[model samples]
Target: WGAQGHRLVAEVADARLNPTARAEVDRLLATEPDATLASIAPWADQLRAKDPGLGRRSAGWHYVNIAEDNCHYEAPKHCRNGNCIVEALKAQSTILGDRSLTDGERLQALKFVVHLVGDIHQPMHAGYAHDKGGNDFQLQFGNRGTNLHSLWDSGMLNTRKLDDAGYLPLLQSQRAPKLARQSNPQRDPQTWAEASCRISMQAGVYPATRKIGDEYTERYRPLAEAQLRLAGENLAQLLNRVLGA
Candidate 1:
């Protein structure tokens, strides 16, 4: 997901956080002035300019390619050395949950946790490696040409013409009820990535033609929005477990 999509995911998680998790989040976020989950949600993506060394090291944490195995994740095959998003989430959440860690360390982990949750939920992020998660799959959208990864990251969401503020309430109203019905939402990052990979493999997601229009957006936008909502829900659940008393 792009900046807007990531922020929206954080916003949804922010609203659902438990009291314990919320307080812990507030305390850790104090390490950086005026920081909120939504504010920090895109920090990982921006690290290339803000902190080049960390950015280069953590770049692979954004997504995992499991399409080679029909959406199933095998760590040895997909995540060689904890470089992929699944392992990144597991490791960072451990750091975030450790009481012995300094606020700075935990805060850094928190940023990655927030961003990676959004990344894992974006289907393309867990898509084919051959295409760099659809980055190489080019097509026409609107009057311009863009790749499938870029289109899923923001183009589909952009169709609604809503900013974070506008999109928040709309997603909440329309999608929250559907999400609430899930009695057992998966918490494991690997499973989440697998689910996203499955979505990417579904029919029509790849689009048969190089040119796409409203028909494409209309079909997939709900799925994208659902992923964001689910990402937020799962993020809140993970944080609550990690930070709860």
Candidate 2:
């Protein structure tokens, strides 16, 4: 997900948060300007410029590259040393939930949770390691040479020509019914990555042609939107549980 996509996920989760979780989030973020989930949703991505050391240390926390043949995520095979997104989510969520931690620690954890949840849902983020999740698979997207990863990150969504605020209502209207049915959605990052990996493994996700056409976006845009919705719903559930009494 790009910055806009990240904000969309955060905005969706922000709307669904329970009162307790919402209050706690506000208190924790109060010190920062424009302190809201959506505002901070892209913070992790910007760390390289603002906080280079932490950026380098946490870079691997953005995604997990599982073998495409089998999307199964064995921690030892896929996420040794608690570096990948799966382990990062598990550890950071723990930090966010621990009441004994200083507000500063929990606040940092909260930022990670908000950002990584969006990242894990972008199927390519959990894609094959051989190609570095399609970064090596080059193609021309409407005369612009780009890789599959960049296409998924923003190209398809950018086709709509709407900002995050403009896109939110449209996505919410389409996804609200489906989201309502997932009252007790799974909170496990492993499952999230596996499901996303399966999407990346799907036929036509990698197009047959080097030049992308409208047919490709038409086919996969719904899946991408659904991922955003699922990420939002799961994020809201996680926050509600962690920050709630």
Candidate 3:
């Protein structure tokens, strides 16, 4: 996802957080440069460029590549060497919930939790291993040539004219319990990644067709919006359980 996409996910979570969770988040992030969850949502992505070593190790934390033929998630193969989004989310959440850990330690975990929740929702993040989550699967949107992964990350949202500000109304108007039910109460990030895989296999545009245009965009727009909504609601659910006041 792009800057706007990440910002919207964090914003959605922020809006839905309970009073206790909000205060705990504030306390944990006080020492950080950007105190708000929305502001800190991109911290993990930015650190990738600023800190090369950490970036290399944390590279796999951004996505999980499921084998295409298998179409099923196997922890050993996809999450080899224990470098994956699922494990990262578990580790971060555990640390965040640990009262004995120092605020500084919890701060790093907090950073990871917010970012990984958003990462797991993007369909391509849990895409096939053969195409490097569609990075190798090339396609053209309008004029520029891009890959399937890139298209899902920013192309869909961009085409819909959806930025952080633009998503506010949709998220707000659809905040009823019915919309909230979209996100399952699974505590495991691996299951969340599976949910993403289902989205990619069904709603996502991948092996079905490499030549996508306005028609593809129009079809998946609602899906992209729903992804953001689910990411936000689920993130809030996790935070409430771990750090709610």
Candidate 4:
């Protein structure tokens, strides 16, 4: 609640980097293989909830809000990571033309790409027929008074120390350049969703282990950690390449 939007605002605000330096960032980020990012890779374990009971429980909204908007409800299938990016980028254009958004708002949109990327990567972000991308599935996360979507959005990251950006580099030797290239040379909506689908399919492979609880989240630390790293590094790489730094 207090964490997701705020912390992401913190890291993603750095989108207006100089281009040449950004190129260096590109090369640096491109070196990693996405398969083995240790922090987030461990998600292979922690086990997915058997019945997420998202209707009554879970916190996926934190993730969904990024991709969803008027267009989403109008054309549900069209709601995708790429679609969100396209729309967000468009919003930036109008703002850039008018110069209306505060520096904070402008940068918020850029950093939004970071949060959006990770959201799509989570797989569940691109939910199924029942839920409008995890909106349907409900679960209780105690004091947060939140749902599964929110849990995935910032739940895991919130559980961790926020001032640990410096630690991300130390967590591994994997660079962003390699991971992006490895993810694919082409950047499109379908590819991102496919990756998500693959990850979500595992919901069956490792059904929810127990009621969604802090203890369960502790057990699920591996998955959350892995995605965070991948999301962060991949985002840095994206900023490096697409933003012209």
lDDT against the true structure, per candidate, is 0.89, 0.87, 0.79, 0.43
Give the range of the ten consecutive residues with the poorest summed lDDT in model 2: 177-186
Instruction: Estimate the lDDT of model 2.
Output: 0.87
| lDDT for each residue of candidate 2 in 77-151, tens digit (9 for 90 to 100) | 888898899899888988888889888888899999999999999999999999999999998988789999999
Cα shift from native, residue 167, model 2 (Å): 0.3
lDDT comparison, 1 vs 4, better candidate: 1
Name the candidate that leads on lDDT: 1
Arranged by lDDT, best first: 1, 2, 3, 4
lDDT per residue (tens digit) for residues 37-69 in model 1: 999999999987769999999999999999989
Model 2 regions more than 4 Å off: 177-187
The alpha-carbon RMSD values of the candidates against the true structure, listed in the order shown, are 2.2, 2.0, 2.6, 11.9
* TM-score for predicted model 1 compared with the true structure: 0.95
TM-score, per-candidate, Cα-based:
0.95, 0.94, 0.89, 0.51
Worst ten in a row by lDDT for model 3: 177-186
Which of 1 and 2 is the better model by TM-score? 1
* Model 3 per-residue lDDT tens digits across residues 19-89: 99988888988877657888878878887567778777787898887647444667687777768887778
| Winner of 1 and 2 under lDDT | 1
Best by TM-score: 1
